[PDB]
Amino acid sequence: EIVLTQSPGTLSLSPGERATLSCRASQSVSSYLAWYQQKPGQAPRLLIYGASSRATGIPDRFSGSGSGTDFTLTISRLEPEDFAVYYCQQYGSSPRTFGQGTKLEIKRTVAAPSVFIFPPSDEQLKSGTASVVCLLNNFYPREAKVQWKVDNALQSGNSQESVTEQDSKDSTYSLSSTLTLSKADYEKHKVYACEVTHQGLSSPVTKSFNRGE
Amino acid sequence: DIQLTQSPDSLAVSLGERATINCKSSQSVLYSSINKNYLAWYQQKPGQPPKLLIYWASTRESGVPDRFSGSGSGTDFTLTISSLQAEDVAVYYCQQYYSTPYTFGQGTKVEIKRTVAAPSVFIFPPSDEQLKSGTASVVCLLNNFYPREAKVQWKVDNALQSGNSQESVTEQDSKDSTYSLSSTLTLSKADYEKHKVYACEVTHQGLSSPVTKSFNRGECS
Amino acid sequence: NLCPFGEVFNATRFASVYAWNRKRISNCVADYSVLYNSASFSTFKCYGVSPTKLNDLCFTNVYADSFVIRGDEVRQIAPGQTGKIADYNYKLPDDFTGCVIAWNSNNLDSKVNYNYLYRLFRKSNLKPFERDISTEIYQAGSTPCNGVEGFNCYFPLQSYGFQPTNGVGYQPYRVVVLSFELLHAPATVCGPK
Amino acid sequence: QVQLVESGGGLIQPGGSLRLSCAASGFTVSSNYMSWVRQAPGKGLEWVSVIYSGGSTFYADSVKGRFTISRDNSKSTLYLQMNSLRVEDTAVYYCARDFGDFYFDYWGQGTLVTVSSASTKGPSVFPLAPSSKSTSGGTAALGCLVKDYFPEPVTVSWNSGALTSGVHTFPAVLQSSGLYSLSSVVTVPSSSLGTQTYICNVNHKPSNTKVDKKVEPKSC
Amino acid sequence: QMQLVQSGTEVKKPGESLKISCKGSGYGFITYWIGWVRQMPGKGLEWMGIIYPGDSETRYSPSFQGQVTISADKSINTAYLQWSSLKASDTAIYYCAGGSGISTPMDVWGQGTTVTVSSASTKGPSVFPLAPSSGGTAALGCLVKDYFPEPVTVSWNSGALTSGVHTFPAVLQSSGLYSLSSVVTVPSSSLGTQTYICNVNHKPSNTKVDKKVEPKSC
Ligand SMILES: *[C@@H]1O[C@H](CO)[C@@H](O[C@@H]2O[C@H](CO)[C@@H](O[C@@H]3O[C@H](CO)[C@@H](O)[C@H](O)[C@@H]3O)[C@H](O)[C@H]2NC(C)=O)[C@H](O)[C@H]1NC(C)=O
């Protein structure tokens, strides 16, 4: 069983710069190695075979190098959909094995998120459960801080966050944080607020609402 | 897959006479490509590993004397010993190597058939050194008899014993072709002291009538 | 009248497995003692007969096939095997009797870088002891190729990348397959006795 | 023009069985190596099995004895029969054209296999109504909350596919409940508040549930 | 020609694992497939499986697959057979055998490896004299009782007396211990003059016992 280790785990580069991925092998496969590109929700696409040969329809900015146990993949001028996960795969000895991938992220200019908050429906309120939703739209970088405050008391342990993958012509991210609780405990409180901290904002941004208005 | 059945299980031959062992196959073992039967005959002497006698059902391994012959084909084969000699007493196995899994025959034990020899019977009471131990063993020995089948029954005040005796047999003696046997009756010191007469009754082909050797506990025998 | 095993085993260059070589041994006295008593071999696997008991038995004809593969694939030169080599390059029958001898030749068939080929593509498996030396462009689609490589049109052969620093499984191994015919005709190949 | 389309994926109890099929076009299935390769949720790729141009077949050790790849030239289809399924088999399975047992030059879109004992549950869809606060000369946001469903996936679009840009359908999150939850939002000009009507279409086929939900500004 | 030599005697408790070995030496070993054969006490041979050391190709018999593992170290010409959890039923002698091809007879045989599996622990024997009571030729002997494991050795007059000696096969009593007897016939003329001593040696328990067998006082 030949183990392939790809390096590094993630890389974040700007449009125009060039990226170099590495793959190292438990034993030597001697050139029998290929590179695939997989975008979110899509299937892998063959980039390079024979460790050096471009597949059909692959632009020239993709280039393969190396042999023995060590191989590298380079993208010459990074463009707004070069951003995916990239896998190396050996076919020197059975069974054929992949590396665990390295994710390529963009680095565009810092963009502040636009913040919205949604109180629960009353249809769901009569259901016995309340879900309050905070939306942070179209920001960069990905790292942000969402803080739920209920009657000015910091809430923890009843919220869940969900992040999109990079929209690939604005290069953005967007995030949702939903707070779930009973209807009894939902009506035990009055003010519900979402406070957002991020690179693109001078100060935390807060969006709130009172229950029943 | 393929099964082998030998016949007979035991065989008693006189010196110089001919021994025959048959091996029947569950399924023909003959590659007609080569026209050879993939059957082998092995010999195993007491304490020794098996030794390959014959392969391809008739071809003799190097060093094997010409008195061993292999015959037959298809499903039926025989091993033949021309003029049985004393050094040929052994268990003989047939084996198929036509395909894996290989399988062996059950084995055929071959001993020297000599004239009937009655055993000599002896009886040994338990030593008092062992009577201090808490148990008591009475030993009854049948020496230098043939054939091997012999009946040895213990009687404690003429009550037939069961489950409390074990017996042992020697390998056939290379010189005189005879056997020896020992039966050991074991019982507690408590049970041993509750009876007087301990008897060993032997029945064998060489005896006109059963012979009994007995002793009374305590009295000098 | 000694059987010429030496010009097969000690040949300076071997054949590619897709075009494997076959020597017809007939009308001679064969000494297999030189084979099974040598310490030059990595594998010596015999089926249906042992090489130590052929020194006293006779056949119609013997066939000595020879070729170079990589170690990973020596497993496939055996009855009941599948894989690129067993399926498209060299196939032994299920009822095969004879020997498969194989030894490492990294010092002879590796430079710095190959020359051996093997068949990658074939629409069906080879029959036992079949040899297909075609170089026709493999048509993997509905559209005919007309002799030009391209999409759905592949060259059927591929070269081993034999290079001395590879792992031993990737290194070239020379393989000789001895098969023994015994139709009911005059037997011409014999042991010394 | 090669096309590969997988089907047959769904929810199945541990120990049960499935048959995945891949319809292929643009090449001759009978004369090409073909392979099944799987990808667990959010993890790497694992080669599952291969069928050679000549019929020979090979399997990864983790599935050997339980999986069987096959092909039909008459229907130009590749099959993977999965028996005695375990939870570790949960993954998206990809049908792939194989260049001589070396590399996969063409891939299908994949089909999702969820091995589990949990029962399927259709989602409840609630509105995330837009601001009354909005900005009356700026931008507003609205959306749909699709909660408490199993198993994956669910499809959500806006105004029957007419509304696509500014749409963010977030990845589902596994709640404490063992059920999935999801939200999808849209960005709009604010005074399109009362000119246009926004309703989200939510389809969860493992449940055969489809709901078209209107999301209006709240009554003051 | 070549020879196979196996590992030594094994005595294990039920549940322990065990790996026995078999090393080949000589010319032609490259051509040899090595099979394993079981022989339980007093019964016949059973083919267990076979391996080719060059690539460790292994074929098991259906009665033994999953029960044992047959492996090989080719660099030292050694085959191996091992259990991960022994049962008392595994008590037997195991022979390794060699054939110069598959579907060929086994030319070469090891000497055998005796494996005892028993909950019993090491205990030296108790030697009791079977004193002569007799008829015309005066049999006597020694009783070597309650020992484990095998084997013991029994000589008479430190090895001088062998003519007429029968050392019986040991029997396994239900206590899990072995018991054995050794007898000898001598002229009753010599019972008052010549002394007879039996020497029992049990190396597993490091026990040497010399006991005199003489007519009992009574
Ligand atoms: C292929 O060529 C090799 C040489 O690389 C041949 O090997 C040599 O073959 C001879 C047989 O005539 C071997 O001879 C014997 O040598 C031993 C001492 O080791 C001696 O005791 C014997 O009496 C006999 O003379 C020789 O050892 C061997 N050399 C090596 C390095 O293996 C081989 O025979 C050729 N193959 C064929 C099929 O002819």
Short mmCIF file of N, CA and C in Angstrom, two decimals, chain E residues 19-127:
data_model
loop_
_atom_site.label_atom_id
_atom_site.label_comp_id
_atom_site.label_asym_id
_atom_site.label_seq_id
_atom_site.Cartn_x
_atom_site.Cartn_y
_atom_site.Cartn_z
N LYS E 19 4.32 -20.01 17.35
CA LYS E 19 4.84 -20.00 15.98
C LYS E 19 6.01 -20.97 15.90
N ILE E 20 5.85 -22.05 15.12
CA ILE E 20 6.91 -23.02 14.90
C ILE E 20 7.48 -22.82 13.51
N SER E 21 8.75 -23.18 13.35
CA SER E 21 9.52 -22.86 12.15
C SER E 21 10.09 -24.13 11.52
N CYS E 22 10.55 -23.98 10.28
CA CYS E 22 11.09 -25.11 9.53
C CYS E 22 12.05 -24.54 8.49
N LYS E 23 13.35 -24.80 8.65
CA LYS E 23 14.38 -24.22 7.81
C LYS E 23 14.94 -25.26 6.86
N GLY E 24 15.07 -24.89 5.59
CA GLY E 24 15.64 -25.76 4.58
C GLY E 24 17.09 -25.41 4.29
N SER E 25 17.88 -26.44 4.00
CA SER E 25 19.30 -26.29 3.76
C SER E 25 19.72 -27.25 2.66
N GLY E 26 20.42 -26.74 1.65
CA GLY E 26 20.94 -27.60 0.62
C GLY E 26 20.70 -27.01 -0.75
N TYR E 27 20.76 -27.87 -1.76
CA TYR E 27 20.70 -27.46 -3.15
C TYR E 27 19.36 -27.87 -3.75
N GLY E 28 18.71 -26.92 -4.42
CA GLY E 28 17.39 -27.13 -4.98
C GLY E 28 16.27 -26.51 -4.18
N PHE E 29 16.57 -25.84 -3.06
CA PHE E 29 15.52 -25.29 -2.21
C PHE E 29 14.67 -24.27 -2.95
N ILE E 30 15.24 -23.60 -3.95
CA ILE E 30 14.48 -22.61 -4.71
C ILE E 30 13.27 -23.26 -5.38
N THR E 31 13.35 -24.56 -5.67
CA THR E 31 12.30 -25.28 -6.36
C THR E 31 11.27 -25.89 -5.43
N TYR E 32 11.42 -25.74 -4.12
CA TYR E 32 10.66 -26.52 -3.15
C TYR E 32 9.46 -25.74 -2.63
N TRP E 33 8.29 -26.36 -2.72
CA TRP E 33 7.11 -25.96 -1.96
C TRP E 33 7.11 -26.73 -0.65
N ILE E 34 6.78 -26.03 0.44
CA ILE E 34 6.83 -26.58 1.78
C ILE E 34 5.41 -26.68 2.32
N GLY E 35 4.97 -27.91 2.58
CA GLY E 35 3.68 -28.16 3.19
C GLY E 35 3.81 -28.52 4.65
N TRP E 36 2.69 -28.40 5.36
CA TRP E 36 2.62 -28.76 6.77
C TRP E 36 1.62 -29.90 6.96
N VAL E 37 1.98 -30.85 7.82
CA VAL E 37 1.20 -32.05 8.06
C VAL E 37 1.04 -32.22 9.56
N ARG E 38 -0.19 -32.48 10.00
CA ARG E 38 -0.48 -32.71 11.41
C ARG E 38 -0.67 -34.19 11.67
N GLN E 39 -0.18 -34.66 12.82
CA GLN E 39 -0.40 -36.03 13.26
C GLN E 39 -0.74 -35.97 14.75
N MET E 40 -2.00 -36.20 15.07
CA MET E 40 -2.41 -36.22 16.47
C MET E 40 -2.05 -37.57 17.09
N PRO E 41 -1.85 -37.61 18.42
CA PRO E 41 -1.31 -38.82 19.06
C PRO E 41 -2.09 -40.09 18.72
N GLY E 42 -1.40 -41.04 18.07
CA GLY E 42 -1.97 -42.32 17.74
C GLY E 42 -2.79 -42.37 16.48
N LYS E 43 -2.97 -41.25 15.78
CA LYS E 43 -3.79 -41.19 14.58
C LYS E 43 -2.92 -40.87 13.37
N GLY E 44 -3.57 -40.72 12.21
CA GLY E 44 -2.88 -40.58 10.95
C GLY E 44 -2.52 -39.14 10.62
N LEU E 45 -1.99 -38.97 9.41
CA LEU E 45 -1.51 -37.67 8.95
C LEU E 45 -2.63 -36.87 8.30
N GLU E 46 -2.59 -35.55 8.49
CA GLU E 46 -3.55 -34.63 7.89
C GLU E 46 -2.79 -33.52 7.19
N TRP E 47 -3.04 -33.36 5.89
CA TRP E 47 -2.43 -32.26 5.14
C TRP E 47 -3.09 -30.94 5.55
N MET E 48 -2.28 -30.00 6.03
CA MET E 48 -2.77 -28.72 6.53
C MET E 48 -2.74 -27.61 5.49
N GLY E 49 -1.68 -27.54 4.71
CA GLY E 49 -1.51 -26.46 3.76
C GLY E 49 -0.12 -26.50 3.18
N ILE E 50 0.13 -25.55 2.28
CA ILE E 50 1.40 -25.50 1.55
C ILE E 50 1.71 -24.06 1.19
N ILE E 51 3.01 -23.76 1.10
CA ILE E 51 3.48 -22.42 0.76
C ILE E 51 4.69 -22.52 -0.16
N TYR E 52 4.82 -21.54 -1.04
CA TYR E 52 6.03 -21.38 -1.83
C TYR E 52 6.82 -20.20 -1.28
N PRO E 53 8.01 -20.42 -0.72
CA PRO E 53 8.71 -19.32 -0.04
C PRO E 53 9.10 -18.17 -0.95
N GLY E 54 9.27 -18.42 -2.25
CA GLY E 54 9.74 -17.37 -3.14
C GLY E 54 8.80 -16.18 -3.22
N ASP E 55 7.48 -16.43 -3.23
CA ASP E 55 6.49 -15.36 -3.22
C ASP E 55 5.41 -15.57 -2.17
N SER E 56 5.60 -16.51 -1.25
CA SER E 56 4.67 -16.77 -0.15
C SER E 56 3.26 -17.08 -0.66
N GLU E 57 3.15 -17.65 -1.85
CA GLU E 57 1.87 -18.18 -2.30
C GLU E 57 1.44 -19.31 -1.37
N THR E 58 0.24 -19.20 -0.82
CA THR E 58 -0.23 -20.08 0.23
C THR E 58 -1.55 -20.71 -0.17
N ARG E 59 -1.65 -22.03 -0.02
CA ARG E 59 -2.90 -22.75 -0.23
C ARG E 59 -3.21 -23.56 1.02
N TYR E 60 -4.36 -23.30 1.62
CA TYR E 60 -4.77 -23.96 2.85
C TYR E 60 -5.72 -25.11 2.55
N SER E 61 -5.79 -26.04 3.49
CA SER E 61 -6.85 -27.03 3.37
C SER E 61 -8.12 -26.50 4.03
N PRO E 62 -9.29 -26.79 3.46
CA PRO E 62 -10.54 -26.24 4.02
C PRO E 62 -10.74 -26.53 5.50
N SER E 63 -10.22 -27.65 6.00
CA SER E 63 -10.36 -27.98 7.41
C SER E 63 -9.47 -27.13 8.31
N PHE E 64 -8.53 -26.38 7.74
CA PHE E 64 -7.57 -25.60 8.52
C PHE E 64 -7.56 -24.12 8.19
N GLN E 65 -8.25 -23.68 7.14
CA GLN E 65 -8.26 -22.26 6.80
C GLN E 65 -8.91 -21.46 7.92
N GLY E 66 -8.30 -20.33 8.25
CA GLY E 66 -8.73 -19.52 9.37
C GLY E 66 -8.33 -20.03 10.73
N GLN E 67 -7.86 -21.28 10.82
CA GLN E 67 -7.41 -21.85 12.08
C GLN E 67 -5.94 -21.57 12.35
N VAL E 68 -5.11 -21.58 11.30
CA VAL E 68 -3.67 -21.42 11.41
C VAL E 68 -3.19 -20.48 10.31
N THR E 69 -1.96 -20.00 10.46
CA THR E 69 -1.34 -19.14 9.45
C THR E 69 0.00 -19.72 9.03
N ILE E 70 0.17 -19.89 7.72
CA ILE E 70 1.39 -20.43 7.13
C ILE E 70 2.11 -19.29 6.41
N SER E 71 3.33 -18.99 6.84
CA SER E 71 4.10 -17.87 6.30
C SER E 71 5.51 -18.33 5.95
N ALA E 72 6.35 -17.39 5.50
CA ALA E 72 7.70 -17.75 5.11
C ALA E 72 8.61 -16.53 5.16
N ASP E 73 9.85 -16.75 5.60
CA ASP E 73 10.95 -15.81 5.47
C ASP E 73 11.91 -16.42 4.45
N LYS E 74 11.91 -15.87 3.24
CA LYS E 74 12.69 -16.45 2.15
C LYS E 74 14.18 -16.17 2.27
N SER E 75 14.57 -15.07 2.92
CA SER E 75 15.98 -14.73 3.05
C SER E 75 16.75 -15.73 3.91
N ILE E 76 16.06 -16.45 4.80
CA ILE E 76 16.68 -17.46 5.66
C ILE E 76 16.14 -18.85 5.37
N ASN E 77 15.39 -19.02 4.28
CA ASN E 77 14.91 -20.33 3.82
C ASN E 77 14.01 -21.00 4.85
N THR E 78 13.17 -20.21 5.53
CA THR E 78 12.37 -20.73 6.62
C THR E 78 10.88 -20.57 6.32
N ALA E 79 10.12 -21.63 6.55
CA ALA E 79 8.67 -21.57 6.58
C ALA E 79 8.20 -21.56 8.03
N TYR E 80 6.99 -21.04 8.24
CA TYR E 80 6.44 -20.87 9.58
C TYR E 80 4.99 -21.32 9.59
N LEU E 81 4.58 -21.87 10.73
CA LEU E 81 3.18 -22.21 10.99
C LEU E 81 2.83 -21.72 12.38
N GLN E 82 1.76 -20.94 12.50
CA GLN E 82 1.48 -20.35 13.81
C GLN E 82 -0.01 -20.26 14.08
N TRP E 83 -0.35 -20.46 15.36
CA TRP E 83 -1.68 -20.23 15.92
C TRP E 83 -1.63 -18.97 16.76
N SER E 84 -2.74 -18.22 16.79
CA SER E 84 -2.85 -17.07 17.67
C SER E 84 -3.50 -17.41 19.00
N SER E 85 -4.27 -18.49 19.06
CA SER E 85 -4.87 -18.95 20.32
C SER E 85 -4.98 -20.46 20.25
N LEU E 86 -4.18 -21.15 21.06
CA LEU E 86 -4.15 -22.61 21.04
C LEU E 86 -5.28 -23.20 21.87
N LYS E 87 -5.79 -24.33 21.41
CA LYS E 87 -6.70 -25.17 22.18
C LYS E 87 -6.00 -26.47 22.53
N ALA E 88 -6.54 -27.17 23.53
CA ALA E 88 -5.98 -28.47 23.91
C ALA E 88 -6.03 -29.46 22.75
N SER E 89 -6.99 -29.30 21.84
CA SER E 89 -7.11 -30.18 20.69
C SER E 89 -5.95 -30.03 19.71
N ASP E 90 -5.16 -28.95 19.82
CA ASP E 90 -4.01 -28.75 18.95
C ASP E 90 -2.81 -29.59 19.35
N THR E 91 -2.90 -30.35 20.44
CA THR E 91 -1.84 -31.26 20.87
C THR E 91 -1.57 -32.30 19.79
N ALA E 92 -0.38 -32.25 19.19
CA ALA E 92 -0.04 -33.15 18.08
C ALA E 92 1.42 -32.93 17.73
N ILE E 93 1.92 -33.72 16.78
CA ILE E 93 3.23 -33.50 16.19
C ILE E 93 3.02 -32.96 14.78
N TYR E 94 3.75 -31.90 14.45
CA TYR E 94 3.63 -31.24 13.16
C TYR E 94 4.91 -31.46 12.37
N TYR E 95 4.78 -32.06 11.19
CA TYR E 95 5.89 -32.26 10.27
C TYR E 95 5.81 -31.21 9.17
N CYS E 96 6.96 -30.64 8.81
CA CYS E 96 7.05 -29.88 7.58
C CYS E 96 7.66 -30.78 6.52
N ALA E 97 7.12 -30.71 5.31
CA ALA E 97 7.51 -31.58 4.22
C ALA E 97 7.76 -30.74 2.98
N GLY E 98 8.53 -31.29 2.04
CA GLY E 98 8.88 -30.54 0.86
C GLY E 98 8.73 -31.30 -0.44
N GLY E 99 8.11 -30.68 -1.43
CA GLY E 99 8.02 -31.24 -2.77
C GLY E 99 8.56 -30.25 -3.77
N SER E 100 9.25 -30.76 -4.79
CA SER E 100 9.97 -29.89 -5.72
C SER E 100 9.04 -29.24 -6.76
N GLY E 101 7.75 -29.23 -6.48
CA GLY E 101 6.78 -28.53 -7.30
C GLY E 101 5.42 -28.72 -6.66
N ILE E 102 4.44 -28.01 -7.18
CA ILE E 102 3.07 -28.22 -6.71
C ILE E 102 2.50 -29.38 -7.50
N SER E 103 1.67 -30.20 -6.85
CA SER E 103 1.23 -31.46 -7.44
C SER E 103 2.43 -32.35 -7.75
N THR E 104 3.32 -32.46 -6.77
CA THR E 104 4.41 -33.42 -6.74
C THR E 104 4.49 -33.99 -5.34
N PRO E 105 4.94 -35.24 -5.19
CA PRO E 105 5.04 -35.83 -3.85
C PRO E 105 6.06 -35.10 -3.00
N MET E 106 5.99 -35.35 -1.70
CA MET E 106 6.89 -34.72 -0.73
C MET E 106 8.12 -35.60 -0.57
N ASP E 107 9.24 -35.18 -1.18
CA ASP E 107 10.49 -35.92 -1.06
C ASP E 107 11.10 -35.73 0.33
N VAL E 108 11.21 -34.49 0.78
CA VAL E 108 11.97 -34.13 1.97
C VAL E 108 11.01 -33.94 3.13
N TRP E 109 11.40 -34.45 4.30
CA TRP E 109 10.59 -34.34 5.51
C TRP E 109 11.44 -33.85 6.67
N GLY E 110 10.89 -32.94 7.46
CA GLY E 110 11.50 -32.57 8.71
C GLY E 110 11.43 -33.71 9.71
N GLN E 111 12.01 -33.46 10.88
CA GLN E 111 12.02 -34.46 11.94
C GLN E 111 10.77 -34.41 12.81
N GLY E 112 9.99 -33.34 12.73
CA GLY E 112 8.77 -33.22 13.49
C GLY E 112 8.93 -32.31 14.69
N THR E 113 7.86 -31.60 15.03
CA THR E 113 7.81 -30.73 16.20
C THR E 113 6.62 -31.15 17.06
N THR E 114 6.90 -31.59 18.28
CA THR E 114 5.86 -32.04 19.20
C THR E 114 5.32 -30.84 19.97
N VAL E 115 4.01 -30.62 19.88
CA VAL E 115 3.34 -29.52 20.55
C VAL E 115 2.32 -30.10 21.52
N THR E 116 2.49 -29.78 22.80
CA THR E 116 1.55 -30.14 23.85
C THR E 116 0.82 -28.88 24.30
N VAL E 117 -0.50 -28.95 24.34
CA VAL E 117 -1.34 -27.86 24.85
C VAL E 117 -2.14 -28.42 26.01
N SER E 118 -1.94 -27.85 27.19
CA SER E 118 -2.54 -28.40 28.40
C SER E 118 -2.55 -27.33 29.48
N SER E 119 -3.63 -27.31 30.26
CA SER E 119 -3.70 -26.42 31.41
C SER E 119 -2.77 -26.86 32.53
N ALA E 120 -2.32 -28.11 32.52
CA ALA E 120 -1.45 -28.61 33.57
C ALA E 120 -0.13 -27.86 33.60
N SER E 121 0.50 -27.85 34.77
CA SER E 121 1.78 -27.20 34.99
C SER E 121 2.86 -28.24 35.23
N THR E 122 4.11 -27.79 35.15
CA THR E 122 5.25 -28.68 35.28
C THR E 122 5.28 -29.34 36.66
N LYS E 123 5.37 -30.67 36.67
CA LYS E 123 5.50 -31.42 37.91
C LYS E 123 6.36 -32.65 37.66
N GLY E 124 7.31 -32.90 38.56
CA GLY E 124 8.17 -34.06 38.47
C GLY E 124 7.45 -35.32 38.91
N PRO E 125 7.98 -36.47 38.51
CA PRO E 125 7.28 -37.73 38.78
C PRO E 125 7.58 -38.28 40.17
N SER E 126 6.66 -39.12 40.63
CA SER E 126 6.87 -39.94 41.82
C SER E 126 7.20 -41.35 41.38
N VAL E 127 8.30 -41.89 41.87
CA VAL E 127 8.79 -43.20 41.48
C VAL E 127 8.51 -44.17 42.62
#
